[PDB]
Amino acid sequence: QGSKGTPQSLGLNLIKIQCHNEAVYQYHVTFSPSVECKSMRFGMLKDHQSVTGNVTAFDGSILYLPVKLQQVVELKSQRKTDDAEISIKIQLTKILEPCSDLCIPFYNVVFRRVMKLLDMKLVGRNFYDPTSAMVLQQHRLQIWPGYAASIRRTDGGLFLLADVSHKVIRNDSVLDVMHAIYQQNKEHFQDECSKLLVGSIVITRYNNRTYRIDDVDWNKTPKDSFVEITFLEYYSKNYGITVKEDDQPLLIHRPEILLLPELSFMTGIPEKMKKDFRAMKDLTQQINLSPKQHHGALECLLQRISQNETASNELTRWGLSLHKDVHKIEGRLLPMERINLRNTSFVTSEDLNWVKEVTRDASILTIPMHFWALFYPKRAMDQARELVNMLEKIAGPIGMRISPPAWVELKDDRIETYIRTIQSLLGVEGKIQMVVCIIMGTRDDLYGAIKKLCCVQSPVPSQVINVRTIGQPTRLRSVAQKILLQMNCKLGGELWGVDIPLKQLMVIGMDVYHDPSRGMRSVVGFVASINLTLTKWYSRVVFQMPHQEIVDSLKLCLVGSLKKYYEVNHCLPEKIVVYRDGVSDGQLKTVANYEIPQLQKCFEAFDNYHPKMVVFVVQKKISTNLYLAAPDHFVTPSPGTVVDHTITSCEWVDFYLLAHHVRQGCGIPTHYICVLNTANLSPDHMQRLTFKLCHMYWNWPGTIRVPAPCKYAHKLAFLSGQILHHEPAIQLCGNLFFL
RNA sequence: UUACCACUC
Ligand SMILES: [Mg+2]
Ligand SMILES: [Mg+2]
């Protein structure tokens, strides 16, 4: 493994588990005659709990024990109803190590029992403590603390991963929300109530079970009956809840699920609070915890487990013993890179942020702007004028030459007026390089119309600027510089670069966009390089339409990218590096076994072309946290920290990278898993190439979480899936029009 | 869109 970097003393949120047993014995059971119910099998195995011992993990046909029984054992048992004799035979199958891959499930069951005996409650998959709820009465909210905990196996052994998680609950019932909407709205209250109810998840506090309501029933009432018994008697018998008023509607969830609203409480952060800033600033102050508080919470959980004798007894029945502190590993801090502009290059500073340097000095490639149009409304003449003025002053240091725009004043802020004016100027003047539009307020339909026209119907680059951004006089130079850089990227310019250390290399990045209603046309983006310096990009989009498979179209994208690379370079790439992002944890085998070999066959179209290839799988939603071990307490790790041991997977070759700057909280790295390495790349070269590619995002002067092409593909898929609903025009795919 | 870490009924 790699050895380049500074040795950084790191701490983890993982607690090591020591196994005191020597082996775990797997047995198979047979029933004669046959018995189908699992409960009956457990009852017979419970009569046979004797002999077999009192520590059992039985799932229906496979039995796990910690005691070595004979090779074959026969037992006779009494059937409950027929009063018959049933023979149960238990036979050894194989001997597993305590830290084996097949022991994880029933170990997780044991740990669920352990945490349940600590008075904790299970909502979803995490364990929350409702007695320590923290009430924001100013907002009528409750924050329930808890942990997401699971036992896993890694190269370094058996570990328990625990992460602090908070749940948001509403103090008021959903019936109270219904009454409020009925109060402030008289006629349209049904539609608004349905709109609020559908997306939101709901719980029931008497049983702490979560349902996702999709519809609301208006006709039935608690007085009615259901599968024959009534709701009121049912609830007053099972729980004795005295219902105050019985005129309420019902709630319908479909996987029927019929719930009452007085007994139902919504979840999730409120919709209104997201737009508020003071509210979210306070909630962020309360929820996100520093590394010191996170470690304190983990230590508190461990202390709580240790001080409880029954919880520890449930673990030591299998010879397991949690340690008294988190696991401390050693990571490496990777060396920094040189960011190159046209005439100067700078050592990236310790902050991994270079916003000033880009604005000060010139870019690799600049496209002169001589013919461009500015479409501004009646009430933004002044600010718009001011904007243009600054665009002329800031342009010189960057090295851009911009002429005055073609001023077009829109007589009214109607969407059709915008579209007609833009189309008319497009038709009359065929030379306009860029259309800049100024919009009043928040209008998403206008944005959709503008981008649909400029990207699909008529292929011209477009930019949208909101009046609030350019209205504030104090912040206009800085925003003008970023706007001009974005326009330069859209025209086909090149801003900065890094020194790529492998020759004849082509980088491909993919990412997948899923609709919030995921049963839709899922979009897969594709961004590849067509330049030796990795500054030009060829981008395509493919859709998951029914009755065909996506890999077939990915082949067309790959072969087209190869042809464009040949046009630019008069050769074909020796090494092709593919960054596959967006795949879940349960499809790694599917991607590695099927998709990558399928793509590899497209290369036969070019005669006698066998490229070396490295394929990665990128995962962002990991639950591992890193801490830096300062002499005083736990702080944020430095950007650029790599971990390649003691938490990696034992099946693949993989590593964890932290490349961005965490302003507050514990760092969450990115997991890179290599499924194909035909090029025989050393691990260190893989790590440093990924870290370099994290610097090539031209829409943010600084390092990002994922490689640049993955982010570009994600942005293209998002644009093509939500805003455009259609493939972009082929003419625009040569440049990064989608920024 | 200036741009980013953000066994129920
Ligand atoms: Mg993604
Ligand atoms: Mg943009």
User: Is A429 in a helix, a strand, or coil?
Assistant: coil
Nearest Cα residue to A66 out of A96, A111, A30: A96
Distance A668 CA to ligand 1 centre (A): 16
Q: Which nucleotide is nearest to A439 (CA to C1')?
A: B1
Q: Which residues are within 8 A (CB) of A5 and not within 5 positions of it... i.e. 6 or more apart?
A: A332, A333, A334, A335, A642
CA nearest to nucleotide B4 C1': residue: A700
Distance A336 CA to ligand 1 centre (A): 26
Judging by beta carbons within 10 Å of its beta carbon (0-12, 13-18, 19+), is residue A123 exposed, middle or buried? Answer: middle
Q: Which residues are within 8 A (CB) of A159 and not within 5 positions of it... i.e. 6 or more apart?
A: A14, A15, A16, A17, A151, A152, A153, A327, A647
Of the residues A262, A511, A644, A654, which is catalytic?
A511
Distance A717 CA to ligand 1 centre (A): 9
Q: Which nucleotide is nearest to A39 (CA to C1')?
A: B7
**Strand B: which bases are under 7 Å from protein Cβ?**
1-6, 8-9
Q: How far is A539 from A717, CA to CA, in rounded Å?
A: 10
Nearest Cα residue to A327 out of A624, A695, A29, A19: A624
* Segment (H or E) for A17: strand A14-19
Is residue A243 within 8 A of residue A235, CB to CB? The reply is yes
Question: For A494, which DSSP code?
Answer: B
Q: How far is A17 from A110, CA to CA, in rounded Å?
A: 13
Pairing of the two strands A434-439 and A523-529: unpaired
Judging by beta carbons within 10 Å of its beta carbon (0-12, 13-18, 19+), is residue A498 exposed, middle or buried? Answer: buried
Is residue A5 within 8 A of residue A637, CB to CB? The reply is no
Q: Which residues are within 8 A (CB) of A597 and not within 5 positions of it... i.e. 6 or more apart?
A: none
Q: Measure A470 CA to B4 C1' (Å).
A: 19
Amino acid at the residue A330: E
Written as six digits, the tokens of A356 are 């000033």
Is residue A469 within 8 A of residue A479, CB to CB? The reply is yes
Of the residues A382, A549, A585, A604, which is catalytic?
A549
Pairing of the two strands A434-439 and A372-376: parallel
Radius of gyration from C-alpha coordinates of chain A: 31
Written as six digits, the tokens of A305 are 């487990």
Q: How far is A117 from A315, CA to CA, in rounded Å?
A: 12
CB A19: neighbour CB atoms within 10 A? 17
Q: Measure A663 CA to B5 C1' (Å).
A: 7
For residue A485, the ligand closest to its alpha carbon is 2
Check whether residue A647 and residue A572 sit in a common domain: yes
For residue A711, the ligand closest to its alpha carbon is 1
* Segment (H or E) for A577: strand A575-581
Q: Measure A306 CA to B7 C1' (Å).
A: 34
Answer yes or no: A48 catalytic: no
Check whether residue A359 and residue A484 sit in a common domain: yes
Of the residues A262, A494, A581, A644, which is catalytic?
A581
Written as six digits, the tokens of A675 are 């499924």
For residue A583, the ligand closest to its alpha carbon is 1
Judging by beta carbons within 10 Å of its beta carbon (0-12, 13-18, 19+), is residue A529 exposed, middle or buried? Answer: buried
Tell me phi and psi for residue A211, to 5 degrees.
-120, 150
Answer yes or no: A82 catalytic: no
Alpha-carbon distances, residue A670 vs A274, A331, A578 (angstroms):
27, 14, 16
Is residue A434 within 8 A of residue A490, CB to CB? The reply is yes
Q: Where are the beta strands (DSSP E) in A377-530?
A: 406-409, 434-439, 462-466, 505-513, 523-529
Q: How many residues does chain A have?
A: 739
CB A697: neighbour CB atoms within 10 A? 21
Amino acid at the residue A394: I
CA A425 to chain centre: 42
Answer yes or no: A549 catalytic: yes
Amino acid at the residue A546: P
User: Is A682 in a helix, a strand, or coil?
Assistant: coil
CA nearest to nucleotide B5 C1': residue: A662
Tell me phi and psi for residue A239, to 5 degrees.
-125, -15
Distance in angstroms between the alpha carbons of the first and the last residue of chain A: 37
User: Is A645 in a helix, a strand, or coil?
Assistant: coil
Alpha-carbon distances, residue A1 vs A237, A687, A690 (angstroms):
65, 10, 15
Nearest Cα residue to A598 out of A544, A571, A562, A559: A559
User: Is A321 in a helix, a strand, or coil?
Assistant: strand
Check whether residue A611 and residue A715 sit in a common domain: yes
CA nearest to nucleotide B8 C1': residue: A257
Q: Measure A696 CA to B4 C1' (Å).
A: 14
- What angle do the packed helices A477-491 and A381-398 form, to 10 degrees? 70
Q: Which residues are within 8 A (CB) of A8 and not within 5 positions of it... i.e. 6 or more apart?
A: A330, A331, A332, A333, A628, A637, A638, A641
Alpha-carbon distances, residue A216 vs A173, A187, A197, A208, A716 (angstroms):
15, 17, 8, 21, 37
Evaluated on CA atoms A491, A497, A503, A505, the torsion sign reads negative
Amino acid at the residue A582: G
Angle at A15 between CA A10 and CA A19, to 5 degrees: 130
Nearest Cα residue to A15 out of A146, A147, A149: A149
Answer yes or no: A511 catalytic: yes
Q: Which nucleotide is nearest to A258 (CA to C1')?
A: B9
Q: Which nucleotide is nearest to A723 (CA to C1')?
A: B1
Distance A579 CA to ligand 2 centre (A): 23
Is residue A522 within 8 A of residue A543, CB to CB? The reply is yes
Nearest Cα residue to A64 out of A36, A112, A35, A105: A105
User: Is A126 in a helix, a strand, or coil?
Assistant: strand
For residue A699, the ligand closest to its alpha carbon is 2
Nearest Cα residue to A250 out of A192, A181, A199, A194: A194
Resolution in A: 3.0
Q: Which nucleotide is nearest to A469 (CA to C1')?
A: B2
Distance A465 CA to ligand 2 centre (A): 10
Which alpha helices (H) appear in A80-161, and where do they start and end? 104-116
Distance A435 CA to ligand 2 centre (A): 14
Alpha-carbon distances, residue A402 vs A64, A393, A736 (angstroms):
75, 10, 20
Q: Measure A77 CA to B6 C1' (Å).
A: 61
Check whether residue A478 and residue A380 sit in a common domain: yes
Of the residues A48, A295, A327, A714, which is catalytic?
A714
Written as six digits, the tokens of A26 are 């797997």
Nearest Cα residue to A720 out of A529, A444, A452: A452
Is residue A732 within 8 A of residue A739, CB to CB? The reply is no
Q: Measure A222 CA to B6 C1' (Å).
A: 43
Question: For A618, which DSSP code?
Answer: E
**Strand ranges across the sheet with A575-581:** A537-543, A523-529, A505-513, A575-581, A612-619, A670-677, A653-658, A641-643, A328-333, A6-12, A626-629, A634-635
Q: What number of helices (H) and strands (E) belong to chain A?
A: 21, 38
Check whether residue A639 and residue A533 sit in a common domain: yes
Written as six digits, the tokens of A342 are 């046209």
Q: Which residues are within 8 A (CB) of A403 and not within 5 positions of it... i.e. 6 or more apart?
A: A369, A370, A371, A372
Q: Measure A537 CA to B5 C1' (Å).
A: 26
**Strand ranges across the sheet with A372-376:** A406-409, A372-376, A434-439, A462-466
Check whether residue A483 and residue A544 sit in a common domain: no
User: Is A7 in a helix, a strand, or coil?
Assistant: strand
Check whether residue A536 and residue A458 sit in a common domain: no
Residue-wise burial string across A217-238, b where 16 or more C-beta atoms lie within 10 A, e elsewhere:
eeeeebeeeeeeeebbeebeee
The residue written with tokens 């539609």 in the block is: A191
Evaluated on CA atoms A286, A287, A289, A294, the torsion sign reads positive
Check whether residue A475 and residue A407 sit in a common domain: yes
Alpha-carbon distances, residue A349 vs A63, A334, A485, A495, A670 (angstroms):
58, 13, 21, 18, 22
CB A418: neighbour CB atoms within 10 A? 21
Contacts 24+ apart (CB under 8 A), A704-707: A704/A659, A704/A660, A705/A620, A705/A659, A705/A660, A705/A670, A706/A579, A706/A581, A706/A618, A706/A620, A706/A670, A707/A507, A707/A509, A707/A579, A707/A618
Nearest Cα residue to A711 out of A500, A525, A576: A525
Strand partners, A159: A16, A152
Strand partners, A57: A64
Experimental determination technique: cryo-EM
Amino acid at the residue A232: L
The residue written with tokens 């991607």 in the block is: A591
User: Is A509 in a helix, a strand, or coil?
Assistant: strand
Alpha-carbon distances, residue A94 vs A24, A41, A57, A318 (angstroms):
9, 22, 15, 18
Is residue A90 within 8 A of residue A32, CB to CB? The reply is no
* Segment (H or E) for A285: helix A278-287
User: Is A140 in a helix, a strand, or coil?
Assistant: coil
Is residue A259 within 8 A of residue A251, CB to CB? The reply is yes
For residue A698, the ligand closest to its alpha carbon is 2
Question: For A724, which DSSP code?
Answer: I
Is residue A184 within 8 A of residue A249, CB to CB? The reply is no
Distance A711 CA to ligand 1 centre (A): 8
Check whether residue A477 and residue A519 sit in a common domain: no
Q: Measure A211 CA to B7 C1' (Å).
A: 15
Q: Where are the beta strands (DSSP E) in A179-327?
A: 202-204, 209-211, 215-217, 225-226, 229-230, 250-253, 257-259, 264-266, 320-322
A685: containing domain = 505-724
Question: For A454, which DSSP code?
Answer: I
CA nearest to nucleotide B6 C1': residue: A284
Q: Which nucleotide is nearest to A668 (CA to C1')?
A: B5
Q: Which nucleotide is nearest to A702 (CA to C1')?
A: B4
Check whether residue A686 and residue A539 sit in a common domain: yes
Nearest Cα residue to A484 out of A498, A495, A472, A473: A495
Residues in contact with strand B, defined as Cβ under 7 Å from any of its atoms = A 204, 207, 209, 211, 226-227, 231, 256-259, 284, 439, 442-444, 447, 462-466, 468-469, 475, 478-479, 482-483, 486, 660, 662-663, 699-700, 704-705, 715, 739
Q: Which nucleotide is nearest to A437 (CA to C1')?
A: B1
Nearest Cα residue to A496 out of A370, A367, A366, A687: A366
Pairing of the two strands A202-204 and A225-226: unpaired
Angle at A310 between CA A309 and CA A313, to 5 degrees: 85
Is residue A605 within 8 A of residue A631, CB to CB? The reply is no
Is residue A419 within 8 A of residue A449, CB to CB? The reply is yes
Q: Measure A644 CA to B8 C1' (Å).
A: 45
Check whether residue A487 and residue A628 sit in a common domain: no
CA A472 to chain centre: 34
Is residue A337 within 8 A of residue A695, CB to CB? The reply is yes
Nearest Cα residue to A672 out of A652, A693, A701: A652
Q: How far is A739 from A207, CA to CA, in rounded Å?
A: 48
- What is the longest distance spanned by two Cα atoms in chain A? 98
Q: Measure A81 CA to B5 C1' (Å).
A: 63
User: Is A361 in a helix, a strand, or coil?
Assistant: coil
Check whether residue A558 and residue A676 sit in a common domain: yes
Cis amide linkage into residue A611, ω under 30° from 0:
no
Pairing of the two strands A157-170 and A641-643: unpaired
Angle at A290 between CA A285 and CA A295, to 5 degrees: 135
Q: Which residues are within 8 A (CB) of A701 and not within 5 positions of it... i.e. 6 or more apart?
A: A353, A354, A355, A357, A358
For residue A487, the ligand closest to its alpha carbon is 2
Is residue A370 within 8 A of residue A381, CB to CB? The reply is no
Question: For A702, which DSSP code?
Answer: B
* Segment (H or E) for A32: strand A24-32
Which alpha helices (H) appear in A317-414, and where do they start and end? 355-360, 381-398
Q: Measure A210 CA to B8 C1' (Å).
A: 10
Written as six digits, the tokens of A51 are 């002999």
CA A42 to chain centre: 40
